[PDB]
Amino acid sequence: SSRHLAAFINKFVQFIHKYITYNAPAAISFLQKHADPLHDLSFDNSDLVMLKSLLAGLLTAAEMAPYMKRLSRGQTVEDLLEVLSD
């Protein structure tokens, strides 16, 4: 039942990426010491792309720009309401 926690596992792998970024050898030591559960999780759940990629390997203003445009050039309550709901 691991398929409802996609965002939680996304936060987990964000933590994993930061962990290997600052303290690489500790993350390597932790993963290699417990390699069997990690490989077991990789094999059992084929849906885990990120785990396999991690084990093998080792937005912006461009989208928000029309919305803050509408918010800045928004005079009527309707425009502000719609852009704020968006």
Partner: protein
Amino acid sequence: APLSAQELSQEIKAFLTGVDPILGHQLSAREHARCGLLLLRSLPPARAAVLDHLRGVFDESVRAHLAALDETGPGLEDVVQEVQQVLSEFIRANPKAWAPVISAWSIDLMGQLSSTYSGQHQRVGALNELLQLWMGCRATRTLMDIYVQCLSALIGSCPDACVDALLDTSVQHSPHFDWVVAHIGSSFPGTIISRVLSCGLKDFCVHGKIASVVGILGHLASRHGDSIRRELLRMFHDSVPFLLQLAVMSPALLGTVSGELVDCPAVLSQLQQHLQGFPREELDNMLNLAVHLVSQASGAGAYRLLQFLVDTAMPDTVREACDRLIQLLLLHLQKLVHHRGPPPRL
């Protein structure tokens, strides 16, 4: 399981004439590969046939595997796994005897297929995405695995020759070769990035595609390995505007610019003064590259960069060039901001 002399002759006639001499019928690809493995367990002066047989069998295997992958022959998973096991057994027995010829032959066909197949099939930066596409297939994955074993065996002996052969084959088979060298750079940073920067500077020496290939390789290699790239670039800079060109091509080089802001005292000023003998056209290209780099890519603590730049304007020819550069930078930023008028810039 030894093979007798007459049995060896029969296996020769089987894989070589295609027909087993007793039954009188042509053999299949799986029988061909198993006969090749049987021959691999025997006479090494007979292993050139084994080498071309493995080349042909792996060509057919790659064709079938990638055709099945893109459309989304028979499976060859277990035989390939046994081949992987037996080559690991050889490279464990004695690296010096097997490693050079097998590495050269493998890299040879690995580039041949990269040059031929790539960019021509149904659906075949995007370089790392392409790398995922090849790692979708298993035969090339196993080939890369055993080659990695070869290099791990060839680290203390002569890795320089191996990487020289690798980069030369990449030069012949560019730009379709470079996923292999991208993966090995991810596996092995130092020598690979050193050869990448040497290739880049020699390419600038040539041109003063391949430069784009070098930049793409650097981008694909900067996955948690750009610190060594920054150190190597700094070492090259210590001795060169190819670095500016690559940064213009590769935005990830801005990470090195954060340290480069603190890297350049009066010693750096004199070093810049020494390089100042370049001609006016080269100087124009250099200043255009400098403003494009400091504007379009500096997404870090560049207030320190600006403060250092303005402080230099507060050696003498360096200061004149720097205040001029500041003026051009302001004009460039004005061009960037007030333009096109509607999506915005960045």
